[PDB]
Design a protein around this ligand. Structure first.
Ligand SMILES: COc1cc(Nc2nc(N[C@@H]3CCCC[C@@H]3N)cnc2C(N)=O)cc(OC)c1
Length: 271
């Protein structure tokens, strides 16, 4: 729909940007208010840094992926500087939250609760025939009620035929990305499952970097030998064995997100 018919378009005047939360090569992210009263996150595109069509692609995707467990598109402003406005998440990124005094005090019960919320959002993505491709604790956001939502849909894609193949100069975070995606550029929902196992290590270590004391070449080398990440300190063995299922060698042998959600809810209620 053109901007004058798009239900998501709002006049820029409806927005007041209050506090800058981040800034990077491609723009800034602010906390602001819509129509005086409603707190929102506003992402602005730095003109020239990247295509406006490329920037807005993220918003268009979020229009197709609406669920309680996913950060919700609020609005767009499609005149320069282009804004994407989203649901504000008061405790920020999970990777950051788990290091704060509140995050530090969480019991394993609550960490298992949050893991299940994340699996629940990923089960919706899976059911809709999407993949995320950037699943990691930096891209989970936390609410003021300590519930978690999936965020950052820039790499997210509709799957037509089970798999998306990236450019052959395309580069991904080695520690979080499935071998088949690093090696062949081939991504499926089973690649997100691998990433989810790595995300579980970040939850249990309160946001530590995966594969402690290893470089990327060393991670690749160990994986090809058949090793997986060493048991993190204070990780319940049940949770470690669930991670190992996510890291099965064949993508098709890895579990579904619906299964993962089910198991983690059982771990939670039993703790
Ligand atoms: C200081 O970082 C905070 C961020 C947010 N919130 C958000 N940050 C988003 N990106 C940031 C970019 C730079 C890196 C941090 C974030 N990922 C994206 N979206 C939201 C959102 N929908 O709320 C809330 C906060 O309150 C405690 C602190």
């Amino acid at each position: 729909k053109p901007w004058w018919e798009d239900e998501w378009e709002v006049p820029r005047e409806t927005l007041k940007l209050v506090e800058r939360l981040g800034a990077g090569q491609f723009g800034e992210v602010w906390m602001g208010y819509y129509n005086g009263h409603t707190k929102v996150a506003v992402k602005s595109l730095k003109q020239g840094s990247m295509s406006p069509d490329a920037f807005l692609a993220e918003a268009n995707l979020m229009k197709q992926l609406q669920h309680q467990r996913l950060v919700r598109l609020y609005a767009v402003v499609t005149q320069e500087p282009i804004y994407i406005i989203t649901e504000y998440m008061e405790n920020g990124s999970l990777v950051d939250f788990l290091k704060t005094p509140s995050g530090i005090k969480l019991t394993i019960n609550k960490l298992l609760d949050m893991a299940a919320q994340i699996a629940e959002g990923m089960a919706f993505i899976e059911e809709r025939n999407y993949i995320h491709r950037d699943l990691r604790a930096a891209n989970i956001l936390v609410s003021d009620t300590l519930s978690c939502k999936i965020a950052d849909f820039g790499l997210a894609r509709l799957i037509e035929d089970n798999e998306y193949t990236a450019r052959e100069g395309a580069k991904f975070p080695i520690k979080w990305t499935a071998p088949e995606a690093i090696n062949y550029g081939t991504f499926t929902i089973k690649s997100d499952v691998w990433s989810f196992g790595i995300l579980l290590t970040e939850i249990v270590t309160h946001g530590r970097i995966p594969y402690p004391g290893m470089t990327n070449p060393e991670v690749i080398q160990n994986l090809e030998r058949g090793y997986r990440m060493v048991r993190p300190d204070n990780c319940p063995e049940e949770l470690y064995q669930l991670m190992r299922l996510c890291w099965k060698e064949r993508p098709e042998d890895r579990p579904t997100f619906d299964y993962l959600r089910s198991v983690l809810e059982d771990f939670f209620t039993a703790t």
